[PDB]
Structures are given as structure tokens and as C-alpha cells.
Ligand binder design. Structure first.
Ligand code: HEM
Ligand code: 1G9
Length: 394
């Protein structure tokens, strides 16, 4: 006798487990057990993942309901799960979207200058260099401080809450509340600070005193700051780190992108498609009885949308494990989700990776792992798959 198949399958972000394709072919919708002991429906084909993400009756908001089957414990107050919904209801969607665009004056130049400075520092110190701790993560942090309009010196401390804030835990985390309350207080102080007049916090600070937003709570304004910093920094830092691994393991692609940097945007779209950065399926709670393939999902049940299931589906992306720069459907992947909850920072996430990669190939064209790939230490019980250190030589 064996127990029900458990999720996640592996914390390794450098290879996709053989189990994914086997599930996708035989049972693209099947029952699994999460770390909390709850049962869930794991969805692994492109067709079914898109069906679930395009149907609002599979609710993100309802995953926070008391007594619901859970993928993991909340690291934020339950109302924060409905973050975008709260921003939309406050009439703040357009303002937040405009503040997080990579097209702001001098922002891409700031990204290039920051990427170049970080790399020059690594070259001066000499090999081995750690590309996560000393390149990808400081670059993500520096970008988000600039986008938020907060001092660059405040970035490292806000960053330090992240190894706990984005844990995928079976039980509540006391440290997550300590850090959350402290970071909310920091953001409340930013709103009241007269020096903060640019970026997202500068804009929220002015909307806060505008009569058309007088009834929006100060709780929501601080929340926007903490959530966009956290989600953006963890997502861009983790994606860039694992995209660099995908690139290092493909010297032919690395040489082509160095020779023809105009192909970098098409390269990043493929790096996004094959990315294993999300450690768990995206969770949704059924608010009705809905047919998904061969299964009638019952109201109150948890559904997990496996992004790599969709992104490595041979029926949508032929030869899925291969990076191909001339696919007819390049942006049709689910790396940024789909539907109601499509990533609001997708444009900024793309630009961060494109600039980071462009600067790396120019400064370190001979970049290679300084350790056998099996020596990378993969972070466990976390919302992202990331190596603790990324040792390289050049
Ligand atoms: C490579 C970069 C990124 C990747 C791969 C990524 C991926 C995702 C994915 C897949 C979702 C959907 C989650 C779901 O439907 O359950 C999501 C949502 C979100 N992302 Fe991104 N993201 C990235 C960068 C960013 C950036 C730069 C920001 C902000 C500055 C950001 C802010 C958010 C927020 C706030 C949501 C929640 C949307 C909602 O609840 O409706 N992301 N992201
Ligand atoms: C996903 C949902 N929306 C949010 O904005 C925050 C912040 C967030 C955004 C994207 C993530 O991958 C994680 C958290 N919390 C939530 O529970």
C-alpha cells in the first residue's frame, strides 16, 4: 500500500521531473495531497490550466476562507489574498499599473547602470562570484526601491523579510507576522514622509490626500507598498537567477545571444516559458461544481494550476524542453498566469531579465558554473525554486 501522491514533486529548479509528462498524458487532472494534509486537484495540461485560470468561479480570494483545504499557511492577513481586488475597488488600479511600467524616464538606464556596477564589482573581486546574492537579488532590490521611490539604503532590510514572507509552510509562521507588521509600519512612515514624491509611493502619497480617495484606508496604501516590493523582488530575483542557470547550461544559445543581442527579448520569452521558478501550482477554490476534463470539481475544493504542466505541454509547445527563438506562439505561455489575476508587473519583469542578461553577456561572455550543477543547494518549502548560491567563473 502507498499514500496519495504528494505535492510539490521536487524543489530542483534545473530540471522538470519525469512525473509531470506522465501525469499530463494519463491524468491531466488528478487528486494530490498538499503539505498541510489537505487533498487538492492538480491540473497539468495547457488546455485545462487555461480553463481553470479563465474561470473566476475558481476563486483566488476564496482560498483564504476559514476551514478551506489549503495548499499552505497564510503569511499575510486573509484580506491581503484579495490584494488586486482591494486595489481595484479603491479605484487605484490604473495608478499602480502606470507606476510599475519599465517605460518611466531614466528607469531602463538606471537598470543598465546598476547591472554594470554590480558586474564590475564581481570582476574586481575575482572568480568565483555568486550570481544570486551578488547580482540577481541586489539588481531586483535596487529596481524595486527606484520603482517605489524609496531610498536605496532601505532595500536590504526590506529584502531580509523575504526568505520567510514567501515560505510555503504547513503551519502559520510567527516571524512572518513580526516582519509583516514592521514592514507595514515602514510603509506607513513612507506615506507621511515629505521627501517621498516619486515612484509608486510618491504617487500613493499624493492620492492619499486627494478628496477622491479620502475613504481609502491607510492600511491599503501601506499594503500596496509591502506587497509590490515583496512580490516584485522575489519574482524578478528568482526568475533571473534560474534563467541564468538555463542560459549557462546552453552555451550555443549563450554565444548566439552574445553575438546577436537583438534576440535577447525572444530568448527571455523562451526562458520564461521553460522556467521552474514557481514551486507550487497556483491555488484556486471552486465556488461551484465545475467540470474540468474527466473530473467534476465540487464547490469548496482546492485546485492547483501547475505552470510547468502547461508550459511544457507538447500539444501547445512542440519539443517543449528546447529553447526555440522562432515559435509561432511565443508569449502564449503561463509564466505570468492568465485571466483575472494575470501578473501586473509582467512588462517590468521582462525588462529586468532582458537588461540583466544583456549586461551579463557583455561583461562575462565566458560565464560558466564554478561547481558541478548537482552541487547547487535548492531552497525547500518555499513559494519559489532557487539555489541558495549560484557560484560562477568567467
Ligand atoms: C519574472 C517576473 C515575474 C514572474 C514570473 C511573475 C509571475 C506571476 C504570476 C504567475 C502571477 C499569478 C499568480 C496567480 O494567478 O495565482 C503573478 C501575480 C502577481 N505578480 Fe508577478 N511575476 C513577476 C514579476 C512581478 C513584478 C515585477 C511585480 C510587481 C512589481 C509583480 C507583482 C505581482 C502581483 C501583485 C501579483 C498578484 C496579482 C493578483 O493577485 O491579481 N510580479 N506574478
Ligand atoms: C497572490 C495574492 N496577491 C497579492 O498581491 C499578494 C502578494 C503576492 C503576489 C504574487 C505572488 O506570487 C505572491 C504574493 N498576495 C496574495 O496572496
Amino acid at each position: 500500500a502507498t499514500v496519495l501522491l504528494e505535492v510539490p514533486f521536487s524543489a530542483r529548479g534545473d530540471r522538470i521531473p519525469d512525473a509531470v509528462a506522465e501525469l499530463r498524458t494519463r491524468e491531466p487532472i488528478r487528486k494530490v495531497r498538499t503539505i498541510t494534509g489537505a487533498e487538492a486537484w492538480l491540473v497539468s495540461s495547457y488546455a485545462l490550466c487555461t480553463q481553470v485560470l479563465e474561470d473566476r468561479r475558481f476563486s483566488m480570494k476564496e482560498t483564504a476562507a476559514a476551514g478551506a483545504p489549503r495548499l499552505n499557511a497564510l503569511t499575510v492577513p486573509p484580506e491581503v489574498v484579495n490584494n488586486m481586488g482591494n486595489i481595484a475597488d479603491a479605484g487605484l488600479r490604473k495608478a499602480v499599473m502606470k507606476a510599475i511600467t519599465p517605460k518611466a524616464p531614466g528607469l531602463e538606464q538606471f537598470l543598465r547602470d546598476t547591472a554594470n556596477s554590480l558586474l564590475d564589482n564581481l570582476i574586481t573581486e575575482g572568480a568565483p562570484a555568486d550570481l544570486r546574492n551578488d547580482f540577481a537579488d541586489p539588481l531586483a532590490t535596487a529596481l524595486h526601491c527606484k520603482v517605489l521611490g524609496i531610498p536605496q539604503e532601505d532595500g536590504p532590510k526590506l529584502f531580509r523579510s523575504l526568505s520567510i514572507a514567501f515560505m510555503s509552510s504547513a503551519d502559520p509562521i510567527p516571524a512572518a507576522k513580526i516582519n509583516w507588521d514592521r514592514d507595514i509600519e515602514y510603509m506607513a512612515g513612507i506615506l507621511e514622509n515629505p521627501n517621498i514624491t516619486t515612484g509608486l509611493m510618491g504617487e500613493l502619497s499624493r492620492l492619499r490626500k486627494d478628496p477622491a480617495y479620502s475613504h481609502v484606508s491607510d492600511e491599503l496604501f501601506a499594503t500596496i507598498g509591502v506587497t509590490f516590493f515583496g512580490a516584485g523582488v522575489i519574482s524578478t530575483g528568482s526568475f533571473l537567477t534560474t534563467a541564468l542557470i538555463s542560459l549557462i547550461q546552453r552555451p550555443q544559445l549563450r554565444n548566439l545571444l552574445h553575438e546577436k543581442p537583438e534576440l535577447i527579448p525572444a530568448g527571455v520569452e523562451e526562458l520564461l516559458r521553460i522556467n521552474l521558478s514557481f514551486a507550487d501550482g497556483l491555488p484556486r477554490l471552486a465556488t461551484a461544481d465545475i467540470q474540468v476534463g474527466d473530473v467534476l470539481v465540487r464547490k469548496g475544493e482546492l485546485v492547483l494550476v501547475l505552470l510547468e504542466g502547461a508550459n511544457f505541454d507538447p500539444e501547445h509547445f512542440p519539443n517543449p524542453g528546447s529553447i526555440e527563438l522562432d515559435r509561432p506562439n511565443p508569449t502564449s505561455h503561463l509564466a505570468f498566469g492568465r485571466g483575472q489575476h494575470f501578473c501586473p508587473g509582467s512588462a517590468l519583469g521582462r525588462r529586468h531579465a532582458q537588461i540583466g542578461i544583456e549586461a551579463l553577456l557583455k561583461k562575462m561572455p565566458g560565464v560558466d558554473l564554478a561547481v558541478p550543477i548537482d552541487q547547487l543547494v535548492w531552497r525547500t518549502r518555499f513559494q519559489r525554486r532557487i539555489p541558495e548560491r549560484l557560484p560562477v567563473l568567467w
